Design a protein around this ligand. Sequence first.
Ligand SMILES: [Mn+2]
Ligand SMILES: [Mn+2]
Lengths: 281, 104, 580, 278, 301, 290
Amino acid sequence: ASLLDTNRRHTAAVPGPGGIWSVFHAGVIGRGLKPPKFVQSRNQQEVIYNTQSLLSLLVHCCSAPGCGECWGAPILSPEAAKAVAVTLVESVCPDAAGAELAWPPEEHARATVERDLRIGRRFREQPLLFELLKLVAAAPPALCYCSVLLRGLLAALLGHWEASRHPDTTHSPWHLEASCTLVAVMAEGSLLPPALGNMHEVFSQLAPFEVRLLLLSVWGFLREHGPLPQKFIFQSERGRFIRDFSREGGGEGGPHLAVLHSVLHRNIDRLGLFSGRFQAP
Amino acid sequence: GSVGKKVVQETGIKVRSRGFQVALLNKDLKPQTFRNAYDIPRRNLLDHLTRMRSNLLKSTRRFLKGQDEDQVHSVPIAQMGNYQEYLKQVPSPLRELMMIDEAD
Amino acid sequence: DSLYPIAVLIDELRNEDVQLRLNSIKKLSTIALALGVERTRSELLPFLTDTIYDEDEVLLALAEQLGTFTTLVGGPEYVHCLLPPLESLATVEETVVRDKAVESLRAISHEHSPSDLEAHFVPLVKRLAGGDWFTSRTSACGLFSVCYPRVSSAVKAELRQYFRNLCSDDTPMVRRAAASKLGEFAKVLELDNVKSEIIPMFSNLASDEQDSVRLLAVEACVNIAQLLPQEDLEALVMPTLRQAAEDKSWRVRYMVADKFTELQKAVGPEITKTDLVPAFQNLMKDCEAEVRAAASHKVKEFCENLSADCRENVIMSQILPCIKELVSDANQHVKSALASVIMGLSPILGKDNTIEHLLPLFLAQLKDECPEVRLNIISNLDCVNEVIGIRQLSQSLLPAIVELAEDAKWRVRLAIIEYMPLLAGQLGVEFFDEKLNSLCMAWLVDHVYAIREAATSNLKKLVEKFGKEWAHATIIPKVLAMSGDPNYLHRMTTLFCINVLSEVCGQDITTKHMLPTVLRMAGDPVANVRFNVAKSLQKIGPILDNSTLQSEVKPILEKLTQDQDVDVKYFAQEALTVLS
Amino acid sequence: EEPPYAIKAGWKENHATFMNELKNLQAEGLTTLGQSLRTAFDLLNLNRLVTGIDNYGQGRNPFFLEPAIIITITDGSKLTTTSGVQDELHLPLNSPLPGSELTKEPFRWDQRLFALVLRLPGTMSVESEQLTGVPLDDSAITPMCEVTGGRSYSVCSPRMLNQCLESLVQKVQSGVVINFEKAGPDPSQPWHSCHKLIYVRPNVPIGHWPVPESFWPDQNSPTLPPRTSHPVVKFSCTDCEPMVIDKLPFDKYELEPSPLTQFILERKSPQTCWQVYV
Amino acid sequence: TCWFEFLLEESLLEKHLRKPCPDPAPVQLIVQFLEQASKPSVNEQNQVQPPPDNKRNRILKLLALKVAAHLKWDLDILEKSLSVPVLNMLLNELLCISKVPPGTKHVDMDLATLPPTTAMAVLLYNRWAIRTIVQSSFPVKQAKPGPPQLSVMNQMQQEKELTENILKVLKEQAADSILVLEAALKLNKDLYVHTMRTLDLLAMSSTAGLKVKTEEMQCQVCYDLGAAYFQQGSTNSAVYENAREKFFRTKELIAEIGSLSLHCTIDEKRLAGYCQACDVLVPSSDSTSQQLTPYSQVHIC
Amino acid sequence: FTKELDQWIEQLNECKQLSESQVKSLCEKAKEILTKESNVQEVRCPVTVCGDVHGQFHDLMELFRIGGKSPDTNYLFMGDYVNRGYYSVETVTLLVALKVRYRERITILRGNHESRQITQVYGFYDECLRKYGNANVWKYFTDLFDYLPLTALVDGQIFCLHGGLSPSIDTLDHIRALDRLQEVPHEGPMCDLLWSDPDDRGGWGISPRGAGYTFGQDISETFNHANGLTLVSRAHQLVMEGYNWCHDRNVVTIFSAPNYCYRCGNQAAIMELDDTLKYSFLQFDPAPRR
Ligand SMILES: [Mn+2]
Ligand SMILES: [Mn+2]
């Protein structure tokens, strides 16, 4: 009844300029008004336990066979985790042109802005991606193969913090959460040392440019050392790969720890008690 | 004489049996919606009917042009702001005595 | 030592940033006050005079500063010490600096006393007029009018001689400046001295080779004619005006045309009747469009000022055929200039003359292609209305103006709206409803907001004239229909219409017809309509009955004051306060 | 595109038409480089026989020149046709122009082909903006470019693009390409064979003596022997004397820089000359 | 109001400083005075030569020092308002008028032997150097680099390279400044700073200056020394022991003074954060008896 | 605070400038309001879209007489409020005052002339000096120009913007990701949004200006399809009739400065969008000046 209703709307309120009525508008932009596009969200508890069922299934698939150290746990196969990592990369960023595991200069983030924004948007829309990322990070060498996704998400977050105008970081709750989860995952994946793997604890208390500087320090560290699986030494004692940063010659990230220490010192009024988390040993 | 490309592209889809062709849109078929009722979409039928009715009857001491907002105000962008050429078609006034930004 | 303010601390501020130099010059009062007045005269002013700078803005600021330097130099007694530096500024190539320097010189002229004027200022004027460079010579022209009234007679005769020499100089721009300043200079002279010295040189100026000097001569012609006694103008000014009006250059004839009314006022009516009306005639019949337009705008002012005994004879015998030919002029600017004044002839000519002769000319101009013509014609409709009544208006001009209520340009429609109350007040309900009521309603849905606003304000006057029963029968239903419109512009238009209609429709109509429509718009999706509803409820609050305020108006305002849009909140709470 | 639509701006098409046609180009066809090059040369040689600029059978006049350069901008992608991919550049011979047989090549004396091969990657190249010379491209257009007396440009950066465009602007000269060859023993080297250009300076170029034909004319030959587009000019590195008489009309043509010019200016014998033969 | 008016009227400075709303601000007056004296002397050949030691430069510097003395030599305001080269040259000139020859090392001469005003001037210079090093260590939200506008490019680039030169000079003498500050904590005598009157007397032991508590000076010096050690503590954790001592001495001096803060303005929240950081990094034997938050309990365990 | 703002708006409507302290406080409030706005502002459907004003104050008054008074009419201004006009100060001050007073009724975007270099060259700096004697008002306004949103988005369909599109920008998320707090650069994603123009060409092209790109119909088609837009509303180019449709109604240019440099004699139009996105262009001629 679009034309019927339109005919109803053509009833002239006034008799018209000369007894003849013309329609007010010159036309309609597009197909009229856009639909509201109402969103829907399910229960968060059922989401949590659906993720739990999926992640338990993936852990069972990835775990090695198998009292054998009753307080201990089975080792997750880095080959199964590598499979999960490569399919994650393909699902999120199939157009992997800059897919080198070595990280580029952080100026290159300005060349792949669209790719990084796509990665960031997919991480925002699908919270399951972070769960899969930490699943990958549970097996040490596997998170090396997710280097492109980590790099793209970090570039997106760095752009956000550069563009942020708030004085506090909590005004961007998702970006703060994503920065924290990202640093936590690459620390748990042993792509960062313990000192540089703890900065996410103080992110919530910082200004956007400070957290941006810390993430740039993370980028610089990954340029120096690199998430390369050859750096991981298989330890037959526990059947797990190990990244020993001390043999790397700069594993503490002292040049990259100077920025963190200065950020702590500048905000010592609030980050005094957090100094213990970034001690040298 | 052949460099002018004075020919029309084969706007057709040669229909297979398992002659007749399906036409395609062209650049030169500018919709004369006032002069042709087949160019009027169904969704725009009533308001455009009102518009052409007004264009026909209210032309008393006015102008009987084609469709406004199409034949005019869809000028090529090169001629969009040609004020030097535009001022010539207007009567002249009375005398009294980083590179570019569309004027001096 | 680097602490002397005079040389040091000033010549060090010659940096690239000009604004610092202007700031130094702007605060030249403080350095001068720091220095002793005798020290200032001895060291500061010679430094300013001797040094020459090359930035126009600094020089302009310096010249502006020296006009108020009399207090900081030693009072009016020593004010002559300001003359050398301003003289140096009066000789520069830039004209604006020269004009500012001349302004400062004539401002400090008042500070001088007669003896000092003769001792220092008049030699300065002689030096400027006698300078090698023509710039000083033009600068000297503006200095005569302030030194002349307060000097001895011999010095006055000398000043007359140097002004005459300056006028007769071989250099063109010197003659231009002299002709420009001739009007001001001749204001203060003795009348016999004006005749003896100014008038022959003025006539010489009008006959010069250059055309700009002749233009300035005709500019000064008005003042010169105004100064003289009326018994002398036939032999002194009138031949010069005759020469000028027939000049080859159209600029001279043009600026004669703009000055024609003042000439008419100055020379007295009989001289105008005898000698000006052929000059006006061939100015209107002139070949050039600029002079024709200039003469056209002066037709009303010229004709109104003649002697009533011989006025209409002049108008119909000389002016009117020329007007008839100007109405069909090729140039639209001439027609527009004629249109803005042509209706002013209606009371002068009378009713029958207006009907027989002026009314076809109005009708021709009302149907012109040029919008300026149509706009200028309508603006003076009250005059012709008062002259010919409204029976002739309805017979002749009403179909033409009704056609102009749908004009392409909205200012024409605005004029028609502005002239509807007059017609309404002079016409009955029946005729207005037959012809013009629909026109009043057609404008409420106009694209231009100014048209809708004018029509809304016009509804108030229409209801004031034709009563509120007529409004309830003809006005209100077509206004209420606009409330249901999908365009929010029309809903806001009904809110504005209700704003102006509540005042005149009375308590009952506002309460029962308009208020329920106003209240139902509080649920509108457009915030603009919502806060305009709040504004309307504020505005129609006084003229509503007091019983429906707390019951009906107050709940809606309470709902609006917690709305999501901040503007709706603000206007709702303002309404809540005003309701008290 | 195909020959009816290949020519967008040819002869007697004004600059505004050229700009409008350039702005609206669309890349929607096959890499018919050979066919399009053939059509371009045919367009250049369209009016040669009407105006007799070639001077067939009457000597080769360096002052009878209509200097043109073809700047072909392309990529290194392989040449394609409807049937398949062509691994090599071959100009078609079908539909010969009237009189095309008189010169055994499509290009002419006063025509040079320059290729701007765009190898710009989709990623921001990590190479620095080195001020070195532009490389010669290795595509199928480079042999044809070199044969004509031009050269190919390989571009993979906007800086390189600017450099090639500047060099190309410097290479817009009025002249004819001469195939200089070495005759006799030394007095397999770059200066032994070169397709260099000799400059012709107008003021309407003025000249008297033609370059000799590659055959002896006769009045009984039904047909004229075909011409090489670049005359094979042979020089003897003997350092003879440059004899000149006072009033003779002699045409002087300045050679462009080349390894042969480098050799001659390096031996440093300005008072002697190498005799030149056809 | 402009700068030269203070040169023409010598007593205008006092009148302007007693205004409730001095326009321009006193720090802006200091900036103007020192910038005027910083212009290199240019001969008629348009050649850059160092600024001359004329009466104009001397009176400009003296006016800047007087304005600084008006603010009780509050290093915080001079730091957040004046740039590093400006404040550097201001303090160097303050040393010069207070009879400290250029080139002499501040760690050589004893501070107690010198007059109180000269000792306090050397002390303020070393305090400023320490605080400058500490602040330069911090990160700052850099202004966005726009396209080059040469007129301002030249000025802030020469400012930045001057700042870098001053910073490396201070870093070279950082140990000397730390030793100077440490020596000053031993003093038990009343100290006097440079006022209007003392600078005026110096234009052409001693107690002509404004009396300053020994507790307040000790508190400020201990605070700055603790900040400097904390800056150094990241590279060498053993240095944090010194910083803990300095900050607890600062806390004790704050407790002693109570609420009579005049020249000693120290942020209590920042000091509390410093104390917490030192407690966590250098756990004392008595810190275990003090109430430990679950955070610190987990860290210790 | 609101009463004083209303007084300033009433004063500014009569073409009387504010004092320096008033401009300082106004720009402070405007900065604190424009911090919260995104690079792609979201505008509700009933709005009037205006192109360049360029300091022609009396033409802006004509615009208000045509389209209506703020706040009664929602207005979207697409930059270029200064330069090439005699009353740049009054124009920009009134627009900023309307933004501060009526936050949700006024949307002011950034034009290419809202930059320090262009204002220095093309007379906004000179006007500020002439009308105030010091560049502090120019400093306040140019610092405020950095805060202006780059683009707007009416209904999610119409993409209002000053210049045009960029080869480096494919999505609106890229625009939202840009850091607009800076002087407009000579090259880069932000420059093209303020400097580019449409053209009757194929693909991208070098702008005749020294900045931006020039883009053909296929570019705007792909941009609209990829971003779910039906129209790209635009400014930045003189239109003789005030508005012009381009690229098969994918792009429309709007110029709201009649008789642009007081010599071009152009008309000026504004796109009035009603509640249901039914547009209508209100062409208007320059005001009668006394
Ligand atoms: Mn623009
Ligand atoms: Mn513009």
